[PDB]
Design an enzyme around this catalytic site. Structure first.
Site, PDB file in Angstrom:
ATOM      1  N   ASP A  82     -82.173  14.271  58.666  1.00  0.00           N
ATOM      2  CA  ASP A  82     -81.565  14.943  57.509  1.00  0.00           C
ATOM      3  C   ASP A  82     -80.611  14.075  56.679  1.00  0.00           C
ATOM      4  O   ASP A  82     -80.101  14.543  55.664  1.00  0.00           O
ATOM      5  CB  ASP A  82     -80.889  16.257  57.946  1.00  0.00           C
ATOM      6  CG  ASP A  82     -80.644  17.222  56.784  1.00  0.00           C
ATOM      7  OD1 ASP A  82     -79.541  17.805  56.707  1.00  0.00           O
ATOM      8  OD2 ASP A  82     -81.551  17.404  55.952  1.00  0.00           O
ATOM      9  N   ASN A 110     -67.497  27.437  68.087  1.00  0.00           N
ATOM     10  CA  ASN A 110     -66.704  26.575  67.211  1.00  0.00           C
ATOM     11  C   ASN A 110     -65.787  27.364  66.283  1.00  0.00           C
ATOM     12  O   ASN A 110     -66.014  28.548  66.038  1.00  0.00           O
ATOM     13  CB  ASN A 110     -67.643  25.708  66.376  1.00  0.00           C
ATOM     14  CG  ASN A 110     -68.610  24.917  67.230  1.00  0.00           C
ATOM     15  OD1 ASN A 110     -68.207  24.053  68.008  1.00  0.00           O
ATOM     16  ND2 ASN A 110     -69.886  25.224  67.111  1.00  0.00           N
ATOM     17  N   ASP A 169     -72.924  26.324  69.316  1.00  0.00           N
ATOM     18  CA  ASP A 169     -73.873  25.289  69.709  1.00  0.00           C
ATOM     19  C   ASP A 169     -74.752  25.803  70.832  1.00  0.00           C
ATOM     20  O   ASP A 169     -74.254  26.461  71.755  1.00  0.00           O
ATOM     21  CB  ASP A 169     -73.132  24.101  70.293  1.00  0.00           C
ATOM     22  CG  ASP A 169     -72.419  23.272  69.266  1.00  0.00           C
ATOM     23  OD1 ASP A 169     -72.424  23.589  68.058  1.00  0.00           O
ATOM     24  OD2 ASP A 169     -71.842  22.262  69.703  1.00  0.00           O
ATOM     25  N   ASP A 215     -65.466  27.431  63.079  1.00  0.00           N
ATOM     26  CA  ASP A 215     -66.060  27.983  61.868  1.00  0.00           C
ATOM     27  C   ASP A 215     -66.881  29.256  62.133  1.00  0.00           C
ATOM     28  O   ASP A 215     -67.473  29.816  61.201  1.00  0.00           O
ATOM     29  CB  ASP A 215     -66.876  26.927  61.111  1.00  0.00           C
ATOM     30  CG  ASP A 215     -68.106  26.461  61.868  1.00  0.00           C
ATOM     31  OD1 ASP A 215     -68.352  26.918  63.012  1.00  0.00           O
ATOM     32  OD2 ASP A 215     -68.833  25.630  61.292  1.00  0.00           O
ATOM     33  N   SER A 262     -69.537  29.344  64.136  1.00  0.00           N
ATOM     34  CA  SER A 262     -70.826  28.947  64.669  1.00  0.00           C
ATOM     35  C   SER A 262     -70.747  28.749  66.178  1.00  0.00           C
ATOM     36  O   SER A 262     -69.662  28.715  66.762  1.00  0.00           O
ATOM     37  CB  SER A 262     -71.312  27.653  64.006  1.00  0.00           C
ATOM     38  OG  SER A 262     -70.540  26.544  64.441  1.00  0.00           O
ATOM     39  N   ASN A 319     -76.461  23.476  66.307  1.00  0.00           N
ATOM     40  CA  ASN A 319     -75.439  24.321  65.695  1.00  0.00           C
ATOM     41  C   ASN A 319     -76.001  25.446  64.824  1.00  0.00           C
ATOM     42  O   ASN A 319     -76.873  25.228  63.971  1.00  0.00           O
ATOM     43  CB  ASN A 319     -74.475  23.442  64.894  1.00  0.00           C
ATOM     44  CG  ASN A 319     -73.301  24.209  64.364  1.00  0.00           C
ATOM     45  OD1 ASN A 319     -73.313  24.667  63.226  1.00  0.00           O
ATOM     46  ND2 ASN A 319     -72.282  24.373  65.193  1.00  0.00           N
ATOM     47  N   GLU A 347     -73.148  16.259  75.317  1.00  0.00           N
ATOM     48  CA  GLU A 347     -73.219  17.533  74.614  1.00  0.00           C
ATOM     49  C   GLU A 347     -73.316  18.710  75.584  1.00  0.00           C
ATOM     50  O   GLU A 347     -72.598  19.699  75.433  1.00  0.00           O
ATOM     51  CB  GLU A 347     -74.378  17.557  73.620  1.00  0.00           C
ATOM     52  CG  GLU A 347     -74.182  16.660  72.409  1.00  0.00           C
ATOM     53  CD  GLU A 347     -73.136  17.154  71.423  1.00  0.00           C
ATOM     54  OE1 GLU A 347     -72.467  18.189  71.693  1.00  0.00           O
ATOM     55  OE2 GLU A 347     -72.971  16.476  70.386  1.00  0.00           O
TER      56      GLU A 347
HETATM   57  C1  LIG Z   1     -76.627  18.887  66.461  1.00  0.00           C
HETATM   58  C2  LIG Z   1     -75.923  19.672  65.403  1.00  0.00           C
HETATM   59  O1  LIG Z   1     -76.255  20.834  65.167  1.00  0.00           O
HETATM   60  N1  LIG Z   1     -74.948  19.018  64.767  1.00  0.00           N
HETATM   61  C3  LIG Z   1     -74.118  19.632  63.746  1.00  0.00           C
HETATM   62  C4  LIG Z   1     -72.685  19.672  64.265  1.00  0.00           C
HETATM   63  O2  LIG Z   1     -72.379  20.330  65.482  1.00  0.00           O
HETATM   64  C5  LIG Z   1     -71.339  19.999  66.408  1.00  0.00           C
HETATM   65  C6  LIG Z   1     -70.103  20.878  66.243  1.00  0.00           C
HETATM   66  O3  LIG Z   1     -69.613  20.695  64.926  1.00  0.00           O
HETATM   67  C7  LIG Z   1     -69.026  20.486  67.253  1.00  0.00           C
HETATM   68  O4  LIG Z   1     -67.852  21.285  67.101  1.00  0.00           O
HETATM   69  C8  LIG Z   1     -69.517  20.667  68.682  1.00  0.00           C
HETATM   70  N2  LIG Z   1     -70.841  20.078  68.815  1.00  0.00           N
HETATM   71  C9  LIG Z   1     -71.885  20.207  67.801  1.00  0.00           C
HETATM   72  C10 LIG Z   1     -72.991  19.194  68.066  1.00  0.00           C
HETATM   73  O5  LIG Z   1     -72.373  17.911  68.135  1.00  0.00           O
HETATM   74  O6  LIG Z   1     -71.834  20.337  63.353  1.00  0.00           O
HETATM   75  C11 LIG Z   1     -71.712  19.615  62.147  1.00  0.00           C
HETATM   76  C12 LIG Z   1     -70.681  20.314  61.250  1.00  0.00           C
HETATM   77  O7  LIG Z   1     -71.126  21.599  60.855  1.00  0.00           O
HETATM   78  C13 LIG Z   1     -73.084  19.401  61.472  1.00  0.00           C
HETATM   79  O8  LIG Z   1     -72.901  18.401  60.504  1.00  0.00           O
HETATM   80  C14 LIG Z   1     -73.357  18.771  59.194  1.00  0.00           C
HETATM   81  O9  LIG Z   1     -74.770  18.720  59.099  1.00  0.00           O
HETATM   82  C15 LIG Z   1     -75.280  18.974  57.807  1.00  0.00           C
HETATM   83  C16 LIG Z   1     -76.802  19.112  57.848  1.00  0.00           C
HETATM   84  O10 LIG Z   1     -77.406  17.937  58.349  1.00  0.00           O
HETATM   85  C17 LIG Z   1     -74.800  17.867  56.869  1.00  0.00           C
HETATM   86  O11 LIG Z   1     -75.302  18.108  55.575  1.00  0.00           O
HETATM   87  C18 LIG Z   1     -76.133  17.023  55.134  1.00  0.00           C
HETATM   88  O12 LIG Z   1     -75.345  15.932  54.694  1.00  0.00           O
HETATM   89  C19 LIG Z   1     -76.110  14.810  54.288  1.00  0.00           C
HETATM   90  C20 LIG Z   1     -75.197  13.624  53.995  1.00  0.00           C
HETATM   91  O13 LIG Z   1     -74.032  14.075  53.342  1.00  0.00           O
HETATM   92  C21 LIG Z   1     -76.948  15.202  53.073  1.00  0.00           C
HETATM   93  O14 LIG Z   1     -77.706  14.106  52.621  1.00  0.00           O
HETATM   94  C22 LIG Z   1     -77.874  16.355  53.448  1.00  0.00           C
HETATM   95  O15 LIG Z   1     -78.588  16.786  52.313  1.00  0.00           O
HETATM   96  C23 LIG Z   1     -77.059  17.512  54.017  1.00  0.00           C
HETATM   97  N3  LIG Z   1     -77.915  18.591  54.483  1.00  0.00           N
HETATM   98  C24 LIG Z   1     -77.789  19.836  54.025  1.00  0.00           C
HETATM   99  C25 LIG Z   1     -78.732  20.855  54.588  1.00  0.00           C
HETATM  100  O16 LIG Z   1     -76.957  20.172  53.176  1.00  0.00           O
HETATM  101  C26 LIG Z   1     -73.271  17.837  56.843  1.00  0.00           C
HETATM  102  O17 LIG Z   1     -72.817  16.707  56.133  1.00  0.00           O
HETATM  103  C27 LIG Z   1     -72.689  17.776  58.249  1.00  0.00           C
HETATM  104  N4  LIG Z   1     -71.246  17.992  58.209  1.00  0.00           N
HETATM  105  C28 LIG Z   1     -70.374  17.193  58.830  1.00  0.00           C
HETATM  106  C29 LIG Z   1     -68.920  17.550  58.694  1.00  0.00           C
HETATM  107  O18 LIG Z   1     -70.706  16.206  59.489  1.00  0.00           O
HETATM  108  C30 LIG Z   1     -74.172  18.889  62.429  1.00  0.00           C
HETATM  109  O19 LIG Z   1     -75.473  19.048  61.902  1.00  0.00           O
END
Ligand SMILES: CC(=O)N[C@H]1[C@H](O[C@H]2[C@H](O)[C@@H](O)CN[C@@H]2CO)O[C@H](CO)[C@@H](O[C@@H]2O[C@H](CO)[C@@H](O[C@@H]3O[C@H](CO)[C@@H](O)[C@H](O)[C@H]3NC(C)=O)[C@H](O)[C@H]2NC(C)=O)[C@@H]1O
Length: 128
Positions: A101, A46, A52, A48, A50, A59, A35
């Site tokens: 999460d 990124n 990191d 979108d 955002s 993120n 990372e």
């Molecule tokens: C460490 C970090 O912040 N990771 C987030 C990640 O960041 C990446 C970036 O996208 C890359 O381009 C470069 N590096 C960084 C770090 O590796 O970005 C992801 C996309 O935005 C984030 O994933 C999302 O996280 C959210 C929150 O945890 C997920 O929502 C959750 O989903 C679960 C299962 O579906 C659900 O049960 C929870 O309730 C829900 N939480 C919320 C608050 O709604 C979401 O699914 C992820 N999205 C994807 C596409 O994976 C990651 O956190």
């Protein structure tokens, strides 16, 4: 601060990441390596809109506030710049929330692509 490998392992261990949510220390060290290259100051933007931040590339759409990310949720309730500190405390506290999460360490894309399923214990070789 660019951490040494065992230096980071020791710090992560002291903050209780070893086996946190079942993820062994090598998983966390591997994630940080790919990372941030162990650099606490690392930032990357990124598509979108955002960014990191820090050693674990936390993120700004979800976890911290940087004041410029649409749809931000700031779930760790922290300014993103605090995740750039030489002291990893804030990043570890937030990472504990992230990994709890629902998706475990799959939240870290570099972990998913480069660490998951590999011999992660190698990342703590030689460390005391
Ligand atoms: C460490 C970090 O912040 N990771 C987030 C990640 O960041 C990446 C970036 O996208 C890359 O381009 C470069 N590096 C960084 C770090 O590796 O970005 C992801 C996309 O935005 C984030 O994933 C999302 O996280 C959210 C929150 O945890 C997920 O929502 C959750 O989903 C679960 C299962 O579906 C659900 O049960 C929870 O309730 C829900 N939480 C919320 C608050 O709604 C979401 O699914 C992820 N999205 C994807 C596409 O994976 C990651 O956190």
């Amino acid at each position: 601060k660019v951490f040494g490998r065992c230096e980071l392992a020791a710090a992560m261990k002291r903050h209780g990441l070893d086996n946190y949510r079942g993820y062994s220390l090598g998983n966390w060290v591997c994630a940080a390596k790919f990372e941030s290259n162990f650099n606490t100051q690392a930032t990357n933007r990124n598509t979108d809109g955002s960014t990191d931040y820090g050693i674990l590339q936390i993120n700004s759409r979800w976890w911290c506030n940087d004041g410029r990310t649409p749809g931000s949720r700031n779930l760790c309730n922290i300014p993103c710049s605090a995740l750039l500190s030489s002291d990893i405390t804030a990043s570890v506290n937030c990472a504990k929330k992230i990994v709890s999460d629902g998706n475990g360490m799959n939240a870290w894309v570099a972990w998913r692509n480069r660490c998951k399923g590999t011999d992660v214990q190698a990342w703590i070789r030689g460390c005391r």
